[PDB]
Write a protein that holds these residues in place. Structure first.
Motif, short mmCIF file in Angstrom:
data_model
loop_
_atom_site.label_atom_id
_atom_site.label_comp_id
_atom_site.label_asym_id
_atom_site.label_seq_id
_atom_site.Cartn_x
_atom_site.Cartn_y
_atom_site.Cartn_z
N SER A 1 1.00 -1.15 -0.05
CA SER A 1 0.11 -0.02 0.10
C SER A 1 0.85 1.24 0.06
O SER A 1 0.46 2.35 -0.35
CB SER A 1 -0.79 0.04 1.06
N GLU A 2 2.13 0.96 0.54
CA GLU A 2 2.88 2.30 0.59
C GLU A 2 3.94 2.39 -0.60
O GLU A 2 4.81 3.02 -0.64
CB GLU A 2 3.56 2.25 2.23
N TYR A 3 4.00 1.40 -1.40
CA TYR A 3 5.05 0.90 -2.46
C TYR A 3 4.23 1.28 -3.86
O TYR A 3 5.01 0.91 -4.93
CB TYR A 3 5.61 -0.02 -2.54
N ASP A 4 3.05 1.88 -4.01
CA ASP A 4 2.28 2.07 -5.12
C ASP A 4 2.86 3.00 -5.77
O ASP A 4 2.67 2.95 -7.31
CB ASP A 4 0.75 2.08 -4.88
N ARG A 5 3.44 3.98 -5.10
CA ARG A 5 4.09 5.18 -5.97
C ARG A 5 5.40 5.52 -5.76
O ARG A 5 5.82 4.93 -4.57
CB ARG A 5 3.16 6.63 -5.26
N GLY A 6 6.30 5.82 -6.38
CA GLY A 6 7.63 6.53 -6.24
C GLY A 6 7.65 7.62 -5.22
O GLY A 6 6.54 8.16 -4.68
N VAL A 7 8.59 7.84 -4.79
CA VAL A 7 9.14 9.13 -3.69
C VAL A 7 8.85 10.26 -4.41
O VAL A 7 8.68 11.26 -3.64
CB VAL A 7 10.46 9.16 -3.08
N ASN A 8 9.00 10.59 -5.74
CA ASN A 8 8.59 11.72 -6.37
C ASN A 8 7.56 11.94 -7.54
O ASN A 8 7.68 12.41 -8.27
CB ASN A 8 10.11 11.98 -7.47
N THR A 9 6.36 11.55 -6.78
CA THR A 9 4.96 11.58 -7.59
C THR A 9 4.15 12.91 -7.20
O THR A 9 4.20 12.98 -5.87
CB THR A 9 4.47 10.51 -7.66
N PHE A 10 3.68 13.61 -8.07
CA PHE A 10 3.03 14.76 -7.72
C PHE A 10 1.45 14.05 -7.55
O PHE A 10 1.17 13.42 -8.08
CB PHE A 10 2.73 15.74 -8.64
N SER A 11 0.65 14.56 -6.50
CA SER A 11 -0.65 14.47 -6.25
C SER A 11 -1.44 15.19 -7.55
O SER A 11 -0.73 16.08 -8.01
CB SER A 11 -1.00 14.99 -4.96
N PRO A 12 -2.58 15.06 -7.69
CA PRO A 12 -3.37 15.73 -8.65
C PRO A 12 -3.61 17.22 -8.22
O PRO A 12 -3.94 17.95 -8.92
CB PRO A 12 -4.94 15.00 -8.60
N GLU A 13 -3.46 17.67 -6.82
CA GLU A 13 -3.24 19.18 -6.50
C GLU A 13 -2.16 19.60 -6.63
O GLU A 13 -1.90 20.80 -6.20
CB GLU A 13 -3.96 18.99 -5.15
#
Lengths: 236, 250, 201, 65, 197, 214, 213, 243, 238
Positions: A1-13
């Motif tokens: 659940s905590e590895y779905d994204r990289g450390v440098n991904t932007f949120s939609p906001e």
């Protein structure tokens, strides 16, 4: 659940997830208060002792960056250790190169330049895998007079007349807005800081529950002793 | 890239390393290796899991590897990982000998291999080695020694221990039957034979299904030798004779 | 160049000349050959002025970092070891430094001689430079551990004066420093002509 | 070469040479290095001009045979 | 030039060294210790180039103490000597060679007393007695003439005194005082300095 | 370059009202041998800059290639900015100093002439990174044989017309042919003005040999 | 072989006053027995209060001046203020020592005003050894001019002479006279004298012709 | 070449890997350290006694130098790696500083190493907590404790591992200035604290003692059983004072 | 979805969502306005304060004597980009002894910011810049985006509520060209004020002005140097 994204991904906001999570992590730290007056800068942090067998003198939430600069930290102190070491090394490097003292703004900028230097890909071994989880209050006296700076893991740093960081930073800042004024003296600043700390702390304020340090024009970084703290808390 | 990563070196919500536990399950699925420490020596008794009438005769030993002039090891788990680890052990022993011109103490060699195992379990993204090792040897500091290492990197000294299939029953048998300070190599061999017989319950004991190696000191030299088929047959015959005598006397 | 330092009952006395030469030409007669590393540590210049100044400034930076990290002042032995390890990495590359690290720490007065060749020896009296032989002779004739403070001042001044008298690369003025338990003090800076008037006259 | 420093400032005798201050002009920098044979159809013998003697080049630099 | 000498008896090793640290024509130190305590029963004596001696000796000392801390027991004098030789030989062809002449003295609980000789090229030789420096030429003949394998520590001190008296008489260098130490089953004992005032 | 193989002799530069004039002979010498007698040692950098070089000819060809590629790239951008003669001079100084600092110098002494924004540029760069501007330039043996005459004329008359500058350049070329053993009587004259860079050649100087009868 | 160095002449003089600093140099660039150009001043304005003079190998001088300019711009960007004269001196010392094993063949003199407004003069050796002085001569004629400055500015080897504070006009006259003498006796000095005067009202340049032989 | 970010922030601001390392520490055997006036005592529980194991090889108390020693709770192999690195650092500091390390310095080094492993690509945090004790040069006893996150504190008495909460409560109720007056009193206090969670009555206790300017000493089972018998005697004294 | 977490993943619609999220990050910042006349380029930035006791964040930065920028978005990304631009300008002045042309600097910025948008594990620069410069081609106003695209603008506004400022700039672009310095700064201030709510007014605390011109180096007016420009501004027309 905590590895779905990289450390440098932007949120939609438009926000980096890890930076926002570190900002959230800050709010779990103990409250720290910095007040800047024309007579100097005072920093006050709640020690938040967990057990009586613990030695409160081993907790160092206020550190001396240089003779004219002090730092108050909130959040994950182990993360603040490396930033404090970098600040000290930067000040010493500047003294070596230019035979002068750094300004507080330049030290805060040098520390803040490390905030976003994290990432998995295109990184040397030993590079940071995540943002830091600390907010730093830099207080010092330079040729521009006493100055107080606030830094957060977003890399942003601003000058503050009086600011509070930590778990009770919302209530303390509202209290800081009322008590603070430009003509405030250093003694008034210390008294108001201790009053707000006593209001926001769960335990009763005493000479061992808190740290307090001051930087003044003509005087080095000075951490209050237990007798000085007892004298200040005598009448609040 | 992130999607295909298995994250072999991360903690579990309960503080466990899943890959290490799975490698230990692999160890539990392997063949039984037994080690008993006596007063005049130390032995290894492994079960031959590589049995087939069309298999060729083994060169030296299937599961027992000589590490240097004073040490030998037995492996349980993945065979090729065991080959890698034994090569590394020999390299470490030779490096110590080159540096100090003295044979390496056993615990230092075990510590080096366990450091390699821990390094694999902490970083790199690689799967751990699925091998548990038994170490026997002699050194000038502590004499005869017996060590056991885990895929996690944990090791420890023992007087008698077992790894592989049915290792818990063997451990209980050794706990019941091992006598500290009174063991001779003959009594240790008898105990090893009886433990292998009881643990390998599905297959009746024969000299072609077990490998036995002993480590002795003979006039200032370490002798690591593998028991011949006739010797193991005599040991099994003595065990069966004792069992029949007990059956008669009960 | 003549620099000397000796330990006695009231601390460490450090003295030096102030003449810098380029070949047979006197480039400067007002060189501060005693380097105030810290309020508690002193160093001396002999050999390359740039080399000594740069590496003792690096030592000062290291000592300040050490004090910040450990919340305790570095010792004289540790500072001398740090400087020796710093200069040993460039051994054989042409650095020419001879320095004395003087201070007071938990072990009392400290005095170490460190050179670019790699030497690091603790001692009671040291003399470095091209005029160090004359200063050695005078100091040894006049030295005692039980010297009074004014007597130690006079001994150091006289030794440096004799060294400047006999050495062509020594001259200018004598700078005198006294290392005490609560830091060093800059005792005086007397011109060689005034010392000649005082001594010969 | 001429960037030698500290050799003679530390020990009166020894292979190392140089004062406290770096100055190539004071440590035998060539400055205007001219061959004594410059401006001549033939090369001069070694030691023809004693050091310290008033010498006038026979030609500019670069005209050495 | 600095002077080292070692004498091994049936159950002891006796070592001595000059206490002079010299720069150009001047003695800068009159009491300079050249012996490094590797362990509770091992002494390393080092002479050679300035800087190289202390760096190499302290590197070896720290490694030996690290071995003792990691393993719970100490290196034998033979193993320590071989480790020192290996490191010196490795540094010989590297970019940072050490010009050091070494004497390793040690006592082993099982092997007994041992004295090792190492030159700057890192060739290791076990000797009943050995010496280093220019003074070795003037004293090795005396050692050959008077040493016996069963020499007692008193007669060993007397023989060392004879060698140092010859050094006083014939050597051109001023070597007035010597530090003397002895290693036996009880460890390293500091004996009285041999001085010639 | 440690040992230059094929070298060029002196290159001259001279400013006049309206532009600069640069002259160099067309000879590449292999030591004392006049081996390549039809080479060009003057290059057009862009419409406002020209370059002449002495010393190793291979290094000059390399620098010509690099400078031409730089000019091509800058014209490819097409944003209205072009390298000035001063910018070319500064880049050349940086390159020569960088090569000298690596102990791999470009064995050349170059003269940069240009005309931009109604002002003439004359620049000197040597293999060590020594650079300066002057109203007249002369490298190699021309620094001793051609520079005094140009300096004398400029001291009498600080500002020259194009015709006077060309005549003085021709006289200096004739003197260089008389007195320089590595020179040739076949040279080029390059001029830069408000109209651009124009290279003329091959040209010869009229020589007098009546002192042979004295 | 190949020599990466050359001597291009040039003498640099600086005198520090009570409220002023003067940096002066000749404008002749040379190599060997020839003159490269007669207009090549050795004085460079760094800030509104600092002027540096560089003599020696001219390529090294150009590179060092450009590096100093870049570092001053970097400091102004990073610190939001201009460098002081002492900060420039310390930075230049570090820069010169950065090339300790392949030195800049430059003689550097920094002249300007300190933080108190007093004139400050710093002299540098090629590897960065520097100290604060009241007056200094560097370059090819430094040995000629230094004793005369000692006699006339420092009042050395003189008795019954009052140590009157040095004024701007007297210092300017002295600089002109010493450079005239240097142009008389030194072959590398001539063709002009450029003087930069650093006061609290800015930096003022002046040119004085010298003999051209 | 593995550069994955293993320890990352959660939406609530938590580092899950560090929390799981702390959970792994919570599963380790209980380790107890108590600071005295002239002595420092470290006590570690043995989870199980095998009767076939060489006890010398599974000691949880080790010396980092001649003045500093530590105990741990958690993953034994990670603790071994940390101990080796700390020993190397102690030797390096004795080289460069020419002085023995202080307890605070080596504790800082260990904590910084753990924090580095909590914020570096391609690795997981250490799963151990350490109790570093020793004596400074002036002779002041010291007791420090590190955690997987990399934070450290000084303590008068502390307990890590499983059942550490109850042992720490017992220490809070029992640590007094008169309870550490003598060395035997401190030893008995440590054994009583360990006895609040362990069975077999002192048979499952590995006890170590370090004194001022003395090497670390490990108590043999005979001494531990003698101390346990004395503690039972004092229990009977409390029984007789009750009735 | 599954296409919005990586910069190297195209969507079935031919879009990259991480770049759009970085554009949103730019849209989150406070509004700034850039505009130019025939001789000057002006940046006016609306500074924001975290609290009443906090100083307003810096928005206009010095790049070179002829180039300045105003930032909107991630401040650390802005500082990284500013350091890169400063290094490029310093390299240009070191190698060619001339100021770097503004268009070439903007091209370098675009080239640098394009690389992270195509490599796995990198992220787009979450900052947008307004660049004001003066060179041989005159004054220039440039706008950069996280998408690594850049625009040459007569006037531009980026940040929160910049649409009203853009509308005002659209209205008065016809007269932006012939204005003098004071008129141009007043036009920029009115455009910036268009982004402010009615209850909020432009003051000396939240206004920063950056000016570069033919005979004027890039200068930043922040607190008391802003009052002459603020003086003369009429009340909000509502």
């Amino acid at each position: 659940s905590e590895y779905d994204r990289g450390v440098n991904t932007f949120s939609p906001e438009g926000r980096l997830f890890q930076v926002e999570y570190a900002i959230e992590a800050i709010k779990l730290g103990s409250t720290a208060i910095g007040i800047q007056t024309s007579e100097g800068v005072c920093l006050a942090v709640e020690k938040r002792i967990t057990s009586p067998l613990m030695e409160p003198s081993s907790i160092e939430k206020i550190v001396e960056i240089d003779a004219h600069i002090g730092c108050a930290m909130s959040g994950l102190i182990a993360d603040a250790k490396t930033l404090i070491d970098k600040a000290r090394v930067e000040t010493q490097n500047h003294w070596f190169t230019y035979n002068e003292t750094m300004t507080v703004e330049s030290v805060t900028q040098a520390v803040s330049n490390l905030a976003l230097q994290f990432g998995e890909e295109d990184a040397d071994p030993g590079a940071m895998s995540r943002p830091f989880g600390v907010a730093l209050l830099f207080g010092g006296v330079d040729e521009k007079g006493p100055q107080l700076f606030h830094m957060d893991p977003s890399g942003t740093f601003v000058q503050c007349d009086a600011r509070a960081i930590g778990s009770a930073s919302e209530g303390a800042q509202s209290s800081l807005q009322e008590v603070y004024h430009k003509s405030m003296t250093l003694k008034e600043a210390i008294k108001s800081s201790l009053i707000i700390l006593k209001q926001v702390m769960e335990e009763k304020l005493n000479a061992t529950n808190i740290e307090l340090a001051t930087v003044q024009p003509g005087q080095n970084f000075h951490m209050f002793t237990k007798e000085e703290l007892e004298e200040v808390i005598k009448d609040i | 890239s992130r999607r295909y990563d298995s994250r072999t070196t991360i903690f579990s919500p309960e503080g466990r390393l899943y890959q290490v536990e799975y490698a230990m399950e692999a160890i539990g699925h392997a063949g039984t290796c037994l080690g008993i420490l006596a007063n005049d020596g130390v032995l290894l008794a492994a079960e031959r899991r590589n049995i087939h009438k069309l298999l060729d005769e083994v060169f030296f030993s299937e599961k027992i590897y000589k590490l240097n002039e004073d040490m030998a090891c037995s492996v349980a788990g993945i065979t090729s990982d065991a080959n890698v680890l034994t090569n590394e052990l020999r390299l470490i022993a030779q490096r110590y000998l080159l540096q100090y011109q003295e044979p390496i103490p056993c615990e230092q060699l075990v510590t080096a291999l366990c450091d390699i195992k821990q390094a694999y379990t902490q970083f790199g993204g690689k799967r751990p080695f699925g091998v548990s090792l038994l170490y026997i040897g002699w050194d000038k500091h502590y004499g005869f020694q017996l060590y056991q290492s885990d895929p996690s990197g944990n090791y420890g000294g023992w007087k008698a221990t077992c790894i592989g299939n049915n290792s818990a029953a063997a451990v209980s048998m050794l706990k019941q039957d091992y006598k500290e300070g009174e063991m001779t190599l003959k009594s240790a061999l008898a105990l090893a034979i009886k433990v292998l017989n009881k643990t390998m319950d599905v297959s009746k004991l024969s000299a072609e299904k077990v490998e036995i190696a002993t480590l002795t000191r003979e006039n200032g030299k370490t002798v690591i030798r593998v028991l011949k088929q006739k010797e193991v047959e005599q040991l099994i015959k003595k065990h069966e004779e004792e069992e029949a005598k007990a059956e008669r006397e009960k | 160049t003549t620099t000397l330092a000796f330990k006695f009952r009231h601390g460490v006395i450090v003295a030096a000349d102030s003449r810098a030469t380029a070949g047979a030409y006197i480039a400067s007669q007002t060189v501060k050959k005693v380097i105030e590393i810290n309020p508690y540590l002193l160093g001396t210049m002999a050999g390359g002025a740039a080399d000594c100044s740069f590496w003792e400034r690096l030592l000062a930076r290291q000592c300040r970092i050490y004090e910040l990290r450990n919340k305790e002042r570095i010792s004289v032995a540790a500072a001398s070891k740090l400087l020796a390890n710093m200069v040993y990495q460039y051994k054989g590359m042409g650095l020419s430094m001879g320095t004395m690290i003087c201070g007071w720490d938990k072990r009392g007065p400290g005095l170490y001689y460190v050179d670019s060749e790699g030497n690091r020896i603790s001692g009671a009296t040291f003399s470095v430079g091209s005029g160090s032989v004359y200063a050695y002779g005078v100091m040894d004739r006049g030295y005692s551990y039980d010297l009074e403070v004014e007597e130690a001042y006079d001994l150091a001044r006289r030794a440096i004066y004799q060294a400047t008298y006999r050495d062509a690369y020594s001259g200018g003025s004598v700078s005198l420093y006294h290392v005490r338990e609560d830091g060093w003090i800059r005792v005086s800076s007397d011109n060689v002509a005034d010392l000649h008037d005082k001594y010969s006259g | 070469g001429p960037f030698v420093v500290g050799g003679e400032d530390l020990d009166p005798f020894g292979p190392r040479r140089g004062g406290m201050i770096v100055d190539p002009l004071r440590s035998g920098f060539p400055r205007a290095l001219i061959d004594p044979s410059s401006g001549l159809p033939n090369r001069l013998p070694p030691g023809a001009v004693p050091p310290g003697a008033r010498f006038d080049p026979f030609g500019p630099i670069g005209t050495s045979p | 030039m600095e002077y080292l000498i070692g004498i091994q008896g049936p159950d002891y090793v006796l070592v001595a060294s000059d206490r002079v640290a010299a720069s150009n024509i001047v003695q800068m130190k009159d009491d300079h210790d050249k012996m490094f305590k590797m362990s509770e029963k091992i002494l390393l004596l080092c002479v050679g180039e300035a800087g190289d001696t202390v760096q190499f000796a302290e590197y070896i000392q720290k490694n030996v103490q690290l071995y003792k801390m990691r393993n719970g027991y100490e290196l034998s004098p033979t193993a320590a000597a071989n480790f020192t030789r290996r490191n010196l030989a490795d540094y010989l062809r590297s970019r940072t060679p050490y010009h050091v002449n070494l004497l390793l003295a040690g006592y082993d609980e099982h092997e007994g007393p041992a004295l090792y000789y190492m030159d700057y090229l890192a060739a290791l030789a076990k000797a009943p007695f050995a010496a280093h420096g220019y003074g070795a030429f003037l004293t090795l003949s005396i050692l050959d003439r008077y040493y016996t394998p069963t020499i007692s520590r008193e007669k060993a001190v007397e023989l060392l005194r004879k060698c140092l008296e010859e050094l006083q008489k014939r050597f051109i260098l001023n070597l007035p005082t010597f530090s003397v130490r002895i290693i036996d089953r009880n460890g390293i004992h500091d004996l009285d300095n041999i001085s010639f005032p | 370059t440690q040992n230059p193989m094929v070298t060029g002799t002196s290159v001259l530069g001279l400013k006049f009202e309206g532009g600069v004039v640069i002259a160099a002979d067309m000879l590449g010498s292999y030591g004392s041998l006049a081996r390549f007698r039809n080479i060009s040692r003057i290059m057009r950098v862009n419409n406002s800059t020209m370059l002449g070089a002495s010393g190793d000819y291979a290094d000059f060809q390399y620098l010509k290639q690099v400078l031409g590629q730089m000019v091509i790239d800058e014209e490819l951008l097409g944003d209205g900015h072009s390298y000035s003669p001063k910018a070319i001079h500064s880049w050349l100084t940086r390159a020569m100093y960088s090569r000298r600092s690596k102990m791999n110098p470009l064995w050349n002494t170059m003269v940069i002439g240009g005309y931009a924004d109604g002002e003439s540029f004359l620049g000197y760069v040597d293999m060590l990174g020594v650079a300066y501007e002057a109203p007249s330039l002369a490298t190699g043996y021309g620094a001793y044989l051609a520079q005094p005459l140009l300096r004398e004329v400029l001291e009498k008359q600080p500002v020259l017309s194009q015709t006077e500058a060309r005549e003085l350049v021709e006289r200096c070329m004739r003197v260089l042919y008389y007195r320089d053993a590595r020179s040739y009587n076949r040279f080029q004259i390059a001029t830069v003005t408000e109209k651009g860079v124009e290279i003329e050649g091959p040209l010869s100087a009229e020589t007098n040999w009546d002192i042979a009868h004295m | 072989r190949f020599s990466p160095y050359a001597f291009n002449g040039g003498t640099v003089l600086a005198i520090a006053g009570e409220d002023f600093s003067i940096v002066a140099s000749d404008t002749r660039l040379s190599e060997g027995f020839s003159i490269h150009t007669r207009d090549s001043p050795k004085c460079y304005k760094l800030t509104d209060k600092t002027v540096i003079g560089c003599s020696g190998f001219h390529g090294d001088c150009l590179t060092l001046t450009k590096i100093i300019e870049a570092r001053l711009k970097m400091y102004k960007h990073s610190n939001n203020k201009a460098m002081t004269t002492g900060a420039i001196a310390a930075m230049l010392s570090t820069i010169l020592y950065s090339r300790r094993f392949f030195p800049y063949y430059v003689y550097n003199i920094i002249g300007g005003l300190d933080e108190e407004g007093k004139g400050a003069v710093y002299s540098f050796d090629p590897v960065g050894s520097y100290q604060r002085d009241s007056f200094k001569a560097g370059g090819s004629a430094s040995a000629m001019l230094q004793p005369l400055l000692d006699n006339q500015v420092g009042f050395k080897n003189m008795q019954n002479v009052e140590h009157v504070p040095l004024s701007l006009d007297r210092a300017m006259r002295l600089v002109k006279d010493v450079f005239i003498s240097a142009a008389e006796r030194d072959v590398y000095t001539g063709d002009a004298l450029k003087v930069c005067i650093v006061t609290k009202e800015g930096i003022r340049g002046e040119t004085v012709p010298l003999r051209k032989d | 070449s593995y550069d994955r970010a293993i320890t990352v922030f959660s939406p609530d601001g938590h580092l899950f890997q560090v929390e799981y390392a702390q959970e792994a520490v919570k599963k380790g055997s209980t380790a107890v350290g108590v600071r005295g006036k002239d002595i420092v005592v470290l006590g570690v529980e043995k989870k199980s006694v095998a009767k076939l194991q060489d006890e010398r090889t599974v000691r949880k108390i080790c010396a980092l130098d001649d003045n500093v020693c530590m105990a741990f709770a958690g993953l034994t192999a990670d603790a071994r790696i940390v101990i080796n690195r700390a020993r190397v650092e102690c030797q390096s500091h004795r080289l460069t500083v020419e002085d023995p390390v202080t307890v605070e310095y080596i504790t800082r080094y260990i904590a910084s190493l753990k924090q580095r492993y909590t914020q570096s690509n391609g690795r997981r945090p250490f799963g151990i907590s350490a109790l570093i004790v020793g004596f400074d040069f002036d002779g002041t006893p010291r007791l420090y404790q590190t955690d997987p996150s990399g934070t450290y504190h000084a303590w008068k008495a502390n307990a890590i591992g499983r059942g550490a909460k109850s042992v720490r409560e017992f220490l809070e109720k029992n640590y007094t200035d008169e309870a550490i007056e003598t060395d035997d009193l401190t030893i008995k206090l440590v054994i009583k604290a360990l006895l609040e969670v362990v069975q077999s009555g002192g048979k499952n206790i590995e006890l170590a003692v370090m004194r001022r300017d003395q090497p670390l000493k490990i108590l043999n089972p005979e001494e531990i059983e003698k101390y346990v018998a004395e503690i039972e005697k004092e229990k009977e004294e409390n029984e007789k004072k009750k009735q | 979805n599954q296409y919005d977490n990586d910069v190297t993943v195209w969507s079935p619609q031919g879009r990259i969502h991480q770049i759009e999220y970085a554009m949103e990050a730019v849209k989150q910042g406070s509004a700034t306005v850039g505009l130019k006349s025939k001789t000057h380029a002006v940046l006016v930035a609306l500074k924001r304060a975290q609290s009443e006791l906090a100083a307003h964040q810096k928005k206009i930065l010095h790049v070179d004597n002829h180039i300045g920028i105003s930032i909107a978005g991630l401040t650390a990304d802005a500082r990284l980009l500013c350091n890169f631009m400063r290094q490029e300008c310093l390299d240009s002045r070191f190698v060619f002894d001339r100021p770097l042309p503004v268009s070439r600097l903007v091209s370098l910025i675009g080239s640098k910011t394009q690389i992270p948008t195509q490599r796995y594990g990198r992220r787009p620069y979450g900052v947008g810049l307004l660049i004001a410069g003066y060179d041989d081609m005159g004054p220039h106003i440039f706008q950069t985006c996280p998408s690594a695209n850049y625009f040459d603008c007569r006037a531009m506004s980026i940040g929160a509520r910049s649409q009203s400022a853009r509308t005002y700039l659209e209205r008065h672009m016809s007269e932006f060209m012939e204005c003098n310095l004071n008129e141009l700064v007043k036009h920029g201030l009115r455009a910036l004020r268009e982004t402010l709510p009615a209850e909020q007014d432009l003051t000396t605390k939240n206004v920063s002005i950056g000016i570069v011109g033919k005979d004027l180096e890039f200068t930043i007016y922040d607190d008391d140097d802003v009052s002459p420009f603020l003086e003369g501004l009429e009340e909000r027309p509502q």
